[PDB]
Write a protein that binds this DNA or RNA. Structure first.
Ligand SMILES: Nc1ccn([C@H]2C[C@H](O)[C@@H](COP(=O)(O)C(F)(F)P(=O)(O)OP(=O)(O)O)O2)c(=O)n1
Ligand code: NA
Ligand code: NA
Ligand code: NA
Length: 323
DNA sequence: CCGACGGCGCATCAGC
DNA sequence: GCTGATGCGC
DNA sequence: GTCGG
């Protein structure tokens, strides 16, 4: 419920962004995000820094910041950095996909501060950055679930057309049943591809380009594609969207699907459960741990269920994996 | 006090 | 031209 | 910045 502590969470999120994009302190970025998130879930309107400090992730300094915010309705440090031309410009440029803190700083140092300046300096942008600039606004839009379904329709159809033995699963928030998603993440496998066994990814990307669904490529190798797609349109045309496709060995596929469905909290919790049951699970495999902590060979996994069964957990519907 | 905090694929850079 | 590092975004 | 060994 935004209005509850929205001022605080907004404050912490802005601080997080400056740490990541300007100070290049990724661990402070994550600290602020963690604090913002735990506070976002706190079912009460916070009345003091001390009250917030009781939450894991909120420490001495953020408590102080909350006291200042509650007393004055702002934070001096944040007001200052907001009005800082160099800082605010660096922070802004990182909103372009492909421009990170390093590129943003370099651009701003040489007087390139706005999208207009970027537009004027194509020669100084790499391929990814040019695409990020081209679809700047579209990439910041969320994707309604209904469009995700139309997108899924196309992907599953074209994948099957290339080879009916491919298996493709759209993961991320969409598989968790979310009513909107930030992008589309497709996990792909094929019986012919295992850990102990190309063009499998290429043929799928190619077919999706052939029907004009994929419009641009950000990066592409033998196992990972990142690019851009658009649903077909006298109605207004759909925004361009980010799509990733990952080719994963068949024997590691379902660990992959589990992992890339998330959420992070759920993955963390399931990893914890697995441990106390004597198993180590990561993105790729689930392995038994010996009595001295030595990891055994990967266990056979032929479905998401197999994983749950190993750790004696009842199968959890993707829709029920927020925690 | 002081180290961990995720780490991997791909594009591109830096050094040789 | 090769190899490892870095930047970036998942 | 926060946590915890
Ligand atoms: N940087 C990352 C990100 C994700 N993942 C894996 C591990 C993650 O748990 C899993 C899902 O990512 P997610 O939960 O973050 C997300 F995308 F679905 P969400 O932002 O919540 O939703 P939405 O699309 O609406 O923005 O991918 C990862 O390994 N590394
Ligand atoms: Na705390
Ligand atoms: Na960026
Ligand atoms: Na960004």
């Amino acid at each position: 419920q935004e209005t509850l502590n929205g001022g605080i969470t907004d404050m912490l999120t802005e601080l997080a962004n400056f740490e990541k994009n300007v100070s290049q302190a990724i661990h402070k970025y994550n600290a602020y995000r963690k604090a913002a998130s735990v506070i976002a879930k706190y079912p009460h309107k916070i009345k003091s820094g001390a009250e917030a400090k009781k939450l894991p992730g909120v420490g001495t300094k953020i408590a102080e910041k909350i006291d200042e915010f509650l007393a004055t309705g702002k934070l001096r440090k944040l007001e200052k950095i907001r009005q800082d031309d160099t800082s605010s410009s660096i922070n802004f440029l990182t909103r372009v996909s492909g421009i990170g803190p390093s590129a943003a700083r370099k651009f701003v140092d040489e007087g390139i501060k706005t999208l207009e300046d970027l537009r004027k300096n194509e020669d100084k942008l790499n391929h990814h950055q040019r695409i990020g600039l081209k679809y700047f606004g579209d990439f910041e839009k969320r994707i309604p679930r209904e469009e995700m379904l139309q997108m899924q329709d196309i992907v599953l159809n074209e994948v099957k057309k290339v080879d009916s033995e491919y298996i493709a699963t759209v993961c991320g928030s969409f598989r968790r049943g979310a009513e909107s998603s930030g992008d589309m993440d497709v996990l792909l496998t094929h019986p012919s591809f295992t850990s102990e066994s190309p063009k499998l990814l290429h043929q799928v990307v190619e077919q999706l380009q052939k029907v004009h669904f994929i419009t641009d490529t950000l990066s592409k190798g033998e196992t990972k594609f990142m690019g851009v797609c658009q649903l077909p349109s006298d109605e207004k045309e759909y925004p361009h969207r980010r799509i990733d496709i990952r080719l994963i060995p068949k024997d590691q596929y379902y660990c992959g699907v589990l992992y890339f469905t998330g959420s992070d909290i759920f993955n963390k919790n399931m990893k914890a459960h697995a441990l106390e049951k004597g198993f180590t699970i990561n993105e790729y495999t689930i392995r038994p741990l010996g009595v001295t902590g030595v990891a055994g060979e990967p266990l056979p996994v032929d479905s998401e269920k197999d994983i749950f069964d190993y750790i004696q957990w009842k199968y959890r519907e993707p829709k029920d994996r927020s925690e």
